[PDB]
Amino acid sequence: HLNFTQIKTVDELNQALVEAKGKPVMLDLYADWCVACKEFEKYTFSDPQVQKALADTVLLKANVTANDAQDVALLKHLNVLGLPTILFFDGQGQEHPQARVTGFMDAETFSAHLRDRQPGL
């Protein structure tokens, strides 16, 4: 498995970003009831090459299973309309919406995505 850092609230994301100054960041939105999210963990985040490509990236994950106030506020703040969703941030903590992943991608597809669209790297 890849080593993610759990963040819960909008401001935990913001702090995490401020701390990752100078480094590329990726945020995975996850939920227990999300099937394709599970596919990502089992088939994509598990790929040896995908992992090496993410070796020097700050990895963040928000677990939104409960769908509580904080989860909803976060999803709303990120303008996330569904799962799975992966966000990407540059060294200046700025997100690149044009780099979002909103469906499942297998290892190969995701590898090409990181190669062609990942910010800050």
Residue numbers in the entry: 428 to 548
From the paper:
Its role is very specific, to acquire reductant from tmDsbD and transfer it to nDsbD.
Despite the presence of reducing agent (TCEP) in the mother liquor, both proteins were found to be oxidized with a Cys-461–Cys-464 disulfide bond clearly present. Cys-461, Cys-464, Asp-455, and Glu-468 of Q488K-cDsbD overlay well with the same residues of wild-type cDsbD. However, unlike E. coli thioredoxin where Lys-57 forms a salt bridge with Asp-26 (equivalent to Asp-455 in cDsbD), Lys-488 is in close proximity to Glu-468, and the two residues have hydrogen bond interactions with a bridging water molecule. The Nz of Lys-488 has a high solvent accessibility (36%), which makes it possible to interact with the solvent-accessible Glu-468 (side chain solvent accessibility 36%). The Nz of Lys-488 is more than 11 Å away from the thiol group of Cys-461; therefore, this positive charge does not affect the pKa value of Cys-461. The closer proximity of Lys-488 to Asp-455 ensures that this residue has a lower pKa value (7.5) than observed for Cys-461 (10.5). A pKa value of 10.5 ± 0.2 was observed for Cys-461 in Q488K-cDsbDred (closed circles); this is very close to the wild-type value of 10.6 ± 0.2.
